[PDB]
Each structure stands twice: as C-alpha cells, then as structure tokens.
Amino acid sequence: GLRSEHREKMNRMRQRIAQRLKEAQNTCAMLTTFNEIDMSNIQEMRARHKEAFLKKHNLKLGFMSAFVKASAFALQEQPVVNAVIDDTTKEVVYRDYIDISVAVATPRGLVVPVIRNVEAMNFADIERTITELGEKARKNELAIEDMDGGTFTISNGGVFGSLFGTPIINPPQSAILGMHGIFDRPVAIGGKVEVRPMMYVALTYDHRLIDGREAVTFLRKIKAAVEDPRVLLLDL
Amino acid sequence: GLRSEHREKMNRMRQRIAQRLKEAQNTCAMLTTFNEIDMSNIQEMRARHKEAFLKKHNLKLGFMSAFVKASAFALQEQPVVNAVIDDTTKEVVYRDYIDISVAVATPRGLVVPVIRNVEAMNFADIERTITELGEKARKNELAIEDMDGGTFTISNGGVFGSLFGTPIINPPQSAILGMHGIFDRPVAIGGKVEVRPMMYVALTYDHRLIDGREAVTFLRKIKAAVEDPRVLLLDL
C-alpha cells in the first residue's frame, strides 16, 4: 500500500530474546495439554480469610500462591517436569529442589523472577515473596540472579483475559504452566447445569522428557489441589 | 500391508509451498491464543439490515467484514501485529497502512487475496471487494499482485465447521486470525445459563515481535468490536 513503512533497528537485548527463544523450539519438543479448574472453592477462601490474612501478614491474598504450592505438591511427586535435558551431554538433570520462576507483567514488557525453594515454604511466605518482587519489578532494580535459574514456570495471562492459549518455555526448564482467565462458564455438576467461575489451564512440556502420562497427571494434581486445597496437607 | 501404494511426483508449485511454509516456522516463534465471541448481536444485524444492504449496494451481507474492520480498529491501535521482522537486517518494519489478506477456499485448494488499505474503507466497500474477489477466484484469473503483500490475515475455517484450531502464518506477516464456526453453545450471562451462537477465534502470532499482552488484548478488541460493533465508531 502506502510506502510509509518506518523501521527501527533491533538493539541486541530485544533481538537476543528471539535468538535464545528459538533454542527453546528447535531444542524442546513443545506440546501442550489443557484442563479446566473450578475456582469457586478458592475464591471463597479469598472471601473469608482475606482480612484475617491482611491484619496478620499485611499481605494481599491471591489465587496464585495456590498454583505455586500445588505446582510443588505435584512437581515433587513427578520429578521429571522438575528435571531438564542437558544438551552438551545427553543426560537428564533431576533436582530435589524447586525454584519456581513466576512471570509478572510490566510496562517495559515482562520479567520472570524466581521463588527459590518453594518446597520449604508455606502458602503465605510465597505471597511475601511475590509482593517483594512485584514492588521490585516496578522500579527497575530486579537483579539477574533473582531471574537466573528456574525449574518450572507459571504465566498468568488471565489478568488480561485470555481464555486459553499455548505458552512457551523460557529455558532452561522443561515445562511452563499457564493460567487463562476466570470466566463464569456453565458447568455440569451431577447431571444438572450451573454457572461456576472457571479457568482453563495449560501445560506446555518437552516431550523428549515428558510422556503425556507424566503431564496430564501432573496437571490433574494442580487441578485437584485448587478445587480442594485441603489435598495439599494430605500430601496426596 | 498390501504393497499397492501408488505415488505421484510433486510438481514445483505444490512442493514450493512446503518450502516457503517451513520458513514460517523456523523463522517465526508461532504461538496461539484463543477466545470466544458471542455473535448474536451481529446476526441480528444480518437479520434486519440484510435487505436494505441488498436493495442499496446489491451486495450480500456477511459476518466477515466485521472481523476485517475490527481487525483494523485493533490493528491500528497495536501496530506491532501490523509489523514484521526483517531477516536480512534484524529490524522491525512498522506500517501505517494495513492491507489485510483474506483467505477464500476454492476447488483447486485455497488462495489468499488482499484487501488493500482497509483503514480508508467502510463496512460495505469491504464486501464490495470480497465479492469482487470471490468471483475472481472461481475463474482462475486471480493475479499475483492481488495476492502479493499482506500485513495481517484472516482465515475462515468455520464455513467447514471447525470448533477451534491452530492457524499458520503465510509470511511475510506477523500474525493471522482464524474464525472457527458458529455453534449454539451454552453461555452464562448474569449467573444464569443460556444458549448463544458463539465462535472460537484464534490468533497465531510471532512471539519474537509480540508479547502475549500485545495479542490477548488485540484479540479482545476483535472480541468487543464484534459483540458490540458500535465500538468501531467510538474509535475506542
């Protein structure tokens, strides 16, 4: 059309992503599985214990530290999705620990800082860490070591209202979860219909490392540990 | 089984696609996000203003020129998905114009002709252009320059009845929309259930260029500009 196309040069760190992205693909064997989560039982947990959580911890109670804790429940029972594949040597690298890498969206784009050692953390020391890092994201002081590492990753593309979608691994990892909106959608509970707030939830995964058994089941733990968070105490 | 496998040679233009396809992948960083659209408010727009549109313009009123116009509303407010990445030089190519490339299915397969300069077009000069090109598709006179170019692309794989799916970029572009059927599906409007004609809608996108913020939001404009086309006048 109108020859009015203005261009701008790629500075390195903006194109450098594109390079270290296309070694996620062309390295991994990315696939994607989905399920849906009825978030009703955990919204009431944020309707009842919100103030008590505030007047005690002075922290904001979110529906996100569940997906971080449930993703440690499951990620400790299926250590593959905690693991990775080394490329230099062809050898898996299992891990006893988990240092989840959470994504927080920002004006300048997106950062992914880490919550290290979630296995030795409760469901409120997480929210202590997120708020410690959301603040650290707004002012651009977020260091490298805080973003360095990771064994698993969670992306909340639901604050913006996506229904579902295909996340991308931000390596070195072997999977990434993805939360996709809370929309009151009709549901069948007991052969009868009803409306429930519900989230589609996505798990990209490297199929070199992860059979679909190891990933459907992983994502059903995350699905049960969030419809009934009481599971997390049972160590089920 | 039965050694009865007959083969046929690939003539160049039939395999040439396969070559210029696999530089979409291996160049792009294709991902895919989805939402759903309640098309009820625009079907009545085709129940009421159908004849009036006919006795005036002698054109058939479709639910497609909305997705072309809404995809110019949004595509002018998020110029990234209008842009591309040059490969020769690593440099974005933004564009003030839009020359959408629509896909029309044919006996010999599929063609993708262009609607140039949609920003300077109304919601009926589009349908003048489509019908001008659907006719031009049936008789194989569709020139190259009519297909050449493109900054954005729409695929209607809903005439054939797909529920949803993953489109492919037909480069040089940076995204492609995809319309996936109108199925009366149950819906929650106000904590109560009901049936509405609804479409899943897909946006593949190059993640080198497009953060998920820039693509969820893009696809929510297309989602609001089609549940309530009045938005398009507001320039919202």
Added chain:
Amino acid sequence: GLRSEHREKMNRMRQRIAQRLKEAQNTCAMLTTFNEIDMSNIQEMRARHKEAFLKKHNLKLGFMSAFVKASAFALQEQPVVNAVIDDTTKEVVYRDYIDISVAVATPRGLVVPVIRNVEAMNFADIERTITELGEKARKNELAIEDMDGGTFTISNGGVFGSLFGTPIINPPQSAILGMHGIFDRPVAIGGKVEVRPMMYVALTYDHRLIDGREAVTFLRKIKAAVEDPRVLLLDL
C-alpha cells in the same frame, strides 16, 4: 537452590526417541484442529450390546473401535491423510490400504502397535486385535514388525483424563488423532441446555500435505460416525 541435582545418563533408545522425534517436527508442518463429540449414542451401545458382545465374542466392548472404524470410513474417502510425503524423493505416497497404529499406555511408558488392514475388518475383529495386543504389551514380547509401519494413528489420552491437547506425529505418518476424555459437559440441543458426555477430539496434521479443508472435514466424519454409528453402513 540446593546443589543437590543428581543426573543420569541417557541410554540410546531413550534419547533415540528425541532424535527421531525432532525429524517429525522440522520435517512436518504440524498443526492441530479440534472438535467435540457427544458420545451418548455410543455409550448406550455399550449399555445394551455389552453382554451380547461378551457371551458371543468373549471380548470387552469399548468406545474405541468406533474411532478405529470411523477413522477408516473417513480415511478411505480422504486418502491424503492416509498418504505421506517422501523426503528422499519429493513425492507423495498414497495408499489403498490402511494399517492404523494404536497407542496403548504401559508401565515402561508407551508403545504404538498396529492394526493392519482395517478396511477389511469389522467392528469386533478390531477389539479381537486390541485385546490380543494389550495382553502382548503387558508382557514385553511385542515385536518390531507389529509396531513397524503405520499410515494413521490414534492416541487415547482420555483414560488419564485430559480435556484436550496437541498430539504429536510418530512418523512415518501424516496425521494422528487424539481422544481427550469423556466429561459430562453442558450442551445446547435445540436452543435449550443439557448435560451430555462429551469428548474433545484432536487431529494433528502435516500442512504440507493437508489443507485445512482436508482435515476439518476428515474430523467431522469421525464426529458423525461416532454420534451416529449407523453412518458407517451407509458408506456415506
């Protein structure tokens, strides 16, 4: 975190998958389309003719041999998705026969054995073959030639409860179906809502070989031949 990461070496056949996987990708042009199937009319077929099928054939009646037979109905009417692309020579290899490759999950992982010549088989000689191979899977005697070959493939990732997902081709093939759970979900039949057991169903496909017309339609035959299996006699 804790430098407690223990590793293990990749023996060849466990990493060899990763190599012969990444020539599925980087060869194919994998895409994915979805639909949903109301399985109610075929569960009653397993509520009524279950015992009669047992006291006659001493075989267990499943909802799977439909997807094998329906995938021969359609796979004989759209021979492309039966075909492949040769890489040595650039030439399609069409096939009059079909030797479907079914996936059965196992303790040691997953195997994919073949049901050869399904076109010349009924809806009970299939189940004779599956049970002949499920038994053969538990004891690790499953030979190579039994797994060798294939023109089409079915994966049941629904026994484990996936909602939907993206399968992978296990080449040499050109597509793979995928069955994703039976969840009673609300449905609109006649402008009114109701609950029905329903399955999302996925068809990955090589887009070098398969236009989306050739794959949506393929998957609507499988969708009609399973909501009303009577279609399979009509040769429709």
Added chain:
Amino acid sequence: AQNTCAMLTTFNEIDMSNIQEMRARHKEAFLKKHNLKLGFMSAFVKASAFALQEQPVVNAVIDDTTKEVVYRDYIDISVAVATPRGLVVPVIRNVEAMNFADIERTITELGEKARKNELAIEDMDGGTFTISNGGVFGSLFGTPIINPPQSAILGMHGIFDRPVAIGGKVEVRPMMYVALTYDHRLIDGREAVTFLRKIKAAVEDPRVLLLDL
C-alpha cells in the same frame, strides 16, 4: 431567513433506548481512553453526515445574487451551544472526515471556548447544516429557525419516557421528537422526510453508520 426561505417543518420521533445503553456501557471506556464525556449528540452529528452526504440538497443552498444552487461536497455542521449571554452557533468543520469521538473532542473544545467569550468569528462563520438541542431545557417539540446561510436545521426536543407500541403491545421507552425545518424552494418533502428517517434509523440503530446504508 424568512422572506428568503420557504420555511416548513417536519417531525418524527426517535426511540433513544439503544443509544443510552451505548452511554451506559462504553461511557467509562470512552473516558479512560479519550478523557471525553460521551453524549447522545455526536450521533445526531454523524447521522446528519450519513444522510447529508446521501441527500446533498439539504447540504446545498440557494444563492440570491444569482439564482443558482450551490452544492457542496463537504459538510461543516454548525452546532448550537446555549450560554449565559444567550446562544452561539459554532462550527464543526469537515465532519465527513471525522469519527464519533473527534466530534466530542471538538464540542468540548468549543463548550469551553463558549464559557469564556473568546469564540472567534471564523469558528462561527459558515455552515451548511445546523443542529439545535432545545431538549436540555425540556421542550417536547417545536419549530426551529434557519440561521442562514443554510438550507435546513435539525432540532432535538427532549427525552421523555413515553408509551410506545412495539409489536402490537404497549411499553415505555425514552423518546425524542425531532424536527427538520427546511427551505421548500430547494427541498421537496420527499427530500426531507427521508433525510429525517435516516437520522431516525442511524440513532435507533447506530450500526447503520458503518454499513454506509
């Protein structure tokens, strides 16, 4: 104006319900984006360009020096804003090349300019069509006057919930009587009833304005 024109007047009624909800839903979104107040008036400015481009007579005038029509490809609508010192009528030039929010950018730019008496002459000079909102004050209907040089003037007359028949049954709807004075030298009643039915359909269903119907 009189003694030159041949002023007549036709009326219809408009069910404004479908555009009030447009101001119940997209009000905040219009605000947090444009920081402009969404009114039910820029519709009558845009609808009066839809129609005024399809019936160029009511865009035209009659020259008096020479007896010759003056058609116009453009439209520079003259809006009336009421003031303490009386009434002014400033112009919105070139509405055909404007959207439904650059109008409201212009009105608010001029309402502010009206309160402080800096409103220049050229801003009021000209005009091919004119809209008067005598509904802020609550008139039911009435006969506007042309403020020449023009050939017509619209007039909006209040929003009163009045009973209405939709489908052989009665109901209440917010509704506006709408008036079009017009010079009958230039405008047959065909050219003015129909003009005012476009304005009537482009405001009960603003989606018409995209169709270019």
